[PDB]
Each structure stands twice: as C-alpha cells, then as structure tokens.
Design a binder for this molecule. Structure first.
Ligand SMILES: O=c1ccn([C@@H]2O[C@H](COP(=O)(O)OP(=O)(O)O[C@H]3O[C@H](CO)[C@@H](O)[C@H](O)[C@H]3O)[C@@H](O)[C@H]2O)c(=O)[nH]1
Ligand SMILES: O=c1ccn([C@@H]2O[C@H](COP(=O)(O)OP(=O)(O)O[C@H]3O[C@H](CO)[C@@H](O)[C@H](O)[C@H]3O)[C@@H](O)[C@H]2O)c(=O)[nH]1
Ligand SMILES: CCCCCCCCO[C@@H]1O[C@H](CO)[C@H](O)C[C@H]1O[C@@H]1O[C@@H](C)[C@@H](O)[C@@H](O)[C@@H]1O
Ligand SMILES: CCCCCCCCO[C@@H]1O[C@H](CO)[C@H](O)C[C@H]1O[C@@H]1O[C@@H](C)[C@@H](O)[C@@H](O)[C@@H]1O
Ligand SMILES: [Mn+2]
Ligand SMILES: [Mn+2]
Lengths: 283, 283
C-alpha cells in the first residue's frame, strides 16, 4: 500500500543525527524544490526498511530484453536477487520477444517474475509501460522501477529510492553546467529545452515512482514521441530526451545520485562515489 | 487540493543547482529518513510557489488566545499578513474565550479569519484541533499549521514548510545530544523516551502537515494525555512531550530549522541562522 494508515515504528537504537554535522559536505543532498538527492551517508536504511515494511510495500521492476539483449538477463536478475530490495516484495516484469530465452533464475522468498511477450522492432518501452500494462501494475505493485537490462547490481539498491517520482543523475554529466547538457535543442521537438533551462541531466536507464506517477510520465513521454513522429523529427537521445523534458516540467520527489547508474569502464571510480550500486555491462 | 493531477510548470529562468556545490555545508539539510530540513539557502521559493499555486493550495493556521494571551493577537496577525504564505489562500482559525477581544486586522485578498469560541481553563489544544474541528478543517483547507500566539513573524514563512507532517527544531536544543533532551523520562508516562532514543527535540509551538496527518497527530497526543491523566502522571513538558513521542514514532516528512521558531532575547542571532522568521515576544 501507499498513503494508508501508518502504524508506529518500534523502538530502535541508532546514531543520533546531529544538526551541526552534515555527513556529506562534498555534494548537494537536496534539490531546490526540497527533494532529497540520494547518496551513501544520507540515509539510515534500518529506519527506511522499517517504514516501508510496515506498509507491506511491493516493488515492480520492469526490464526489456529484446533481440540480442536477452543475453544480459542472467546477470541482471541474479545480481538483482543479491542487491535489489532484499527483504521486500518484488515483482519482476521481463518484456521480451523470446520468452524461451529468459534464464531460469532462482528467486528469494516473496519475489516473483512474469515473462511478458512483445513484438521485436528503446523508444517503445514508454508505450508498453503506459498503454498495455496500466491495469496490471495498479493491481500488483505499489512502486515501479524501470531500468535498462545491460546492467548489473553490485551493491545495495533499496527502499531509499522509493517516492512518488524519481529520476537518476546521468553519470556522464553530473558535474556539467546546463548549457553542456545534451537536451533536445530544436524548438520543433516536443522534447525541446532552451540553453537557460534545466536542473539536471537524467539518464533514461533508471527512473520510477508510484504506479500512478510512472503511468503519468510514460503516457506523457509516449504522447510527445508520437507528436514528434507525426512532425518528422526524432529527439537526439530518443526516450531520454523526453524523460528530461518531463522531469524539468514535473519535478521529481527524489533524485538518485550516479551511484545508481554508473559506468566504471568509461568513468572509473571517483572519490564522490562511495558505492557503485548499479553499473553498465559491456555492450 | 493535495495529491491531485499536477499540471506542467511553466518555463522558468533560475540558477542551475550544482551537484558538486552544496549551498549549506554548516548544517544537516536532510534527515536519516530522507526528510528535508528546511534552512535558508536550501530552497528556490519561486519553484515551490509555482508548484503549490498550481494546486490552489489553502493553508489553515490555528492559534489559541485564551485569557491574557488575547493581547498577543494584534502583532501575531498583522505580522502574519506581512510574512505568512503571502500569495496563497490562508484561513486563520483563532480560538479564544473572548471573541470581542480579537483585534480587527485588515487582511490581504484570498485570506480569511474565523473566530471560534472555546472555554477557558496549553494541553487542550490537541483536543480542539482533533475532536471539535475535524470536519471543518477537512472541508476548508489542505494543510494545517498549528502555532503558539506569543510570537511574531519577522521574515518569510511560506510553502517550503508544507508536507504531509512537519515538526520544528526547538531553538534551545538543536546542537544538543539526545541524552540532554528534556523528553519525558518516566516509564509510567505515555510520552516516555529512553536516553538512547530520539532524533531531535521538537518544539510544541510550531507543527503541521496535511489535515489528515495533523488530525492523526493531535488525536494520538490527546489520547496519550488522557491515559496519563487517568494514571495520575503529567508529562514534564505537557503537550510538547507527547508531540516528541509521536514524532519519534511517526517520522516527519520535513523538519523546520530553528529559523522557524527562535527567541532572540534568550539565544541571540547565531551565524547558522541566516534568517529569524518567527520569534518569541516577551511574555
Ligand atoms: O536491441 C535492443 C535494444 C535495446 N533494448 C532495450 O533498451 C535498453 C536501452 O538500450 P541500450 O542499448 O542499453 O542503450 P544505451 O546506449 O546503453 O543507453 C542510452 O539509450 C537508452 C535508450 O534510449 C536510454 O535508456 C539510456 O538512458 C541512454 O543512456 C536496453 O538496455 C534494453 O533493455 C533491447 O532490449 N534490445
Ligand atoms: O493562558 C494561556 C496560556 C497559554 N495559551 C496558549 O498556549 C500557548 C502555549 O503557552 P505559552 O505560555 O506560549 O508556553 P511557552 O512556555 O512559551 O511554550 C512552551 O509551552 C507550550 C505549551 O506547552 C509549547 O507549545 C511550547 O513548545 C513550549 O516551549 C500560548 O502561546 C497560547 O497560544 C493561552 O492562550 N492562554
Ligand atoms: C561528457 C562525457 C559523457 C560520457 C557518457 C556519455 O554517455 C552517453 O550519454 C548520452 C547522452 O549524452 C546517452 O545517455 C548515451 C550514453 O551512453 C550510454 O551510457 C554510458 C554511461 C555508457 O555506458 C555507454 O556505453 C552507453 O551507450
Ligand atoms: C539549554 C538552554 C535551553 C533554553 C531554552 C529553553 O526553552 C524552554 O524549553 C522547554 C523544554 O526544555 C520548553 O519548550 C519551554 C521553553 O521555553 C519557552 O521557549 C523559549 C525559547 C523561551 O521563549 C521561553 O520564554 C518559553 O517559555
Ligand atoms: Mn544501456
Ligand atoms: Mn509560547
């Protein structure tokens, strides 16, 4: 459930948060619209796990594995079992054109996987999430997390991310000024963002929120992409360009740091990243 | 409205939030359960005003002025007009045993004041907010802000505070360790908090949230106070002790810094306070 009567937390023993000590002084930990930016050191996972377990929270995870990308599923799912929402109810939704190529992955208790067959041809994920699966998701999960498959979990990804709407800071651009962001810059596209606008550059590979907010986002992005197609224009970074436009105009209620979407081959392991949680696999 | 369909923000020009620059490095700006702590420099009020105006947000402000405390109403209300939620819809609810002693204060457009008569005898405010005014508030406002009257506004107090549930850091204790907090320490009281528990010491003089969450808090505190009365025990700091117990067990979704409740006579003007927003008046 979301937003239902919340019972009292039990007694807990943990370090006192000290008002005149920030943990993190090296990074921005709250946006100018008062959304937390989730970095290691900003959250006590024991408190958050209590809060979300007391709501019997169910998290849906969507992933698309079409054509050759079915090869990424084994590592993706096996590492999700080690690191993604462990202790909570999880429902994986694997969208594929090859149901027989989905690996048989052993799941922990309280976790389930559904294989959903789709047609083969990145930009049509918005349609599938919003048009075909709307009723399914509303009936089955509280939150949806939507990710790329060519990835692996290396460290904790848990309920600290959950909120009505979140995006993830793109690992390539978190230190960049907005003029350098690769937003869509042609006014003829629905994804257009002028050089004097923009908070962050969010990566299309990891977003989520409540089912209602994720359906709103994916519907809006799908509609905007259809308008662009009718006008003979394709945004520079496809669904990611539209996601960025949406999150500019509809501020996320949490922002995930690049701990949550990293490429170590391309970008190494900077001091500001205390953990690499969810990382690109080659190809 | 709260939680209803949110239209797109318009184009806005403002400084880019920079990920590798925190504004505030001198204070904790997010709790360990990922609630913002509201300090000057952490929010862009233009973004927040847009978000809340697009919901046509109405804020109720409750204040009690019983017996000699009617004398505080003129300054309280006149300064609220200068500083409290200016531009938003406001409904003041003034609870008094002397309706004729309520000063005639001129209000800005979109703002209204209701005088509610009560009996004369600090601890029964929880009952009035939760038992007598439940239906009224649900029909009339989106958020409730509940404050002491022996106060004045000196600077902006606006929609940055609004959230499902908030408390305010007590100005006397924000730098203190939890063992020094003046929580109720007798196990025989419903307000009891052991020396190894506690996040913050919240002041009873400024709390709020959505109408639903404020009714939950005030009902719980009223019930706990009734249990203590039946057991012949009175908590050390009365309603404030119970508020603290509630907010330990039900984490607030924002915490206000002591900018929002200050006593300059007793505590001066420390460097960590960039603004003194809402301050004690003598007596
Ligand atoms: O033949 C394909 C191609 C894509 N995918 C799916 O689509 C995702 C995105 O494609 P990918 O090749 O991973 O794109 P990237 O270049 O790694 O990522 C960029 O492109 C994506 C799609 O626009 C965005 O999600 C990312 O944010 C952006 O960095 C994949 O992970 C799969 O889940 C398939 O299943 N089969
Ligand atoms: O004769 C009275 C006494 C109290 N009040 C109301 O009750 C409030 C609280 O009383 P006050 O005298 O202001 O208490 P303080 O000692 O200033 O404040 C402490 O006591 C309050 C009541 O327990 C808590 O709200 C505060 O957090 C705590 O710091 C007042 O502001 C009024 O709104 C009256 O209207 N008439
Ligand atoms: C400045 C240096 C940027 C380095 C990262 C660029 O990443 C690419 O960014 C694009 C938007 O400009 C778009 O999101 C694709 C993205 O490339 C993907 O993500 C990278 C982090 C790598 O994993 C890459 O192989 C992948 O294709
Ligand atoms: C350590 C020094 C603390 C100094 C402030 C003490 O304030 C008092 O704290 C009590 C809880 O311990 C309770 O909230 C009453 C509170 O006193 C009220 O608030 C102060 C800030 C003053 O305005 C005071 O006059 C008022 O009675
Ligand atoms: Mn990818
Ligand atoms: Mn007072």
């Amino acid at each position: 459930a979301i937003g239902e009567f919340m019972v009292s937390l039990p007694r807990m023993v943990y370090p006192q948060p000290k008002v005149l000590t920030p943990c993190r002084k090296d990074v921005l930990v709250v946006t100018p619209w008062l959304a937390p930016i989730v970095w290691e050191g900003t959250f006590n996972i024991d408190i958050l796990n209590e809060q979300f377990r007391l709501q019997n929270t169910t998290i849906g995870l969507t992933v698309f594995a079409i054509k050759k990308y079915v090869a990424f599923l084994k590592l993706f799912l096996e590492t999700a079992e080690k690191h993604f929402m462990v202790g909570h109810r999880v429902h994986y939704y694997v969208f594929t054109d090859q149901p027989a190529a989905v690996p048989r992955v052993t799941l922990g208790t309280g976790r389930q996987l559904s294989v959903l067959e789709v047609r083969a041809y990145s930009m049509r994920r918005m349609e599938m999430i919003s048009d075909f699966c709307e009723r399914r998701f509303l009936s089955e999960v509280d939150y949806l997390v939507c990710v790329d498959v060519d990835m692996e979990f290396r460290d904790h990804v848990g309920v600290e991310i959950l909120t009505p709407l979140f995006g993830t800071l793109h690992p390539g651009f978190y230190g960049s000024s907005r003029e350098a962001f690769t937003y869509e810059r042609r006014p003829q596209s629905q994804a257009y963002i002028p050089k004097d606008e923009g908070d962050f550059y969010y990566m299309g590979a990891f977003f989520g929120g409540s089912v209602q907010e994720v359906q709103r986002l994916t519907r809006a992005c799908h509609q905007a992409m259809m308008v662009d197609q009718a006008n003979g224009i394709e945004a520079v970074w496809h669904d990611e360009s539209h996601l960025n436009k949406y999150l500019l105009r509809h501020k996320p209620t949490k922002v995930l740091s690049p701990e949550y979407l990293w490429d170590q081959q391309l970008l190494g392991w900077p001091a500001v990243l205390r953990k690499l949680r969810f990382t690109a696999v080659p190809k």
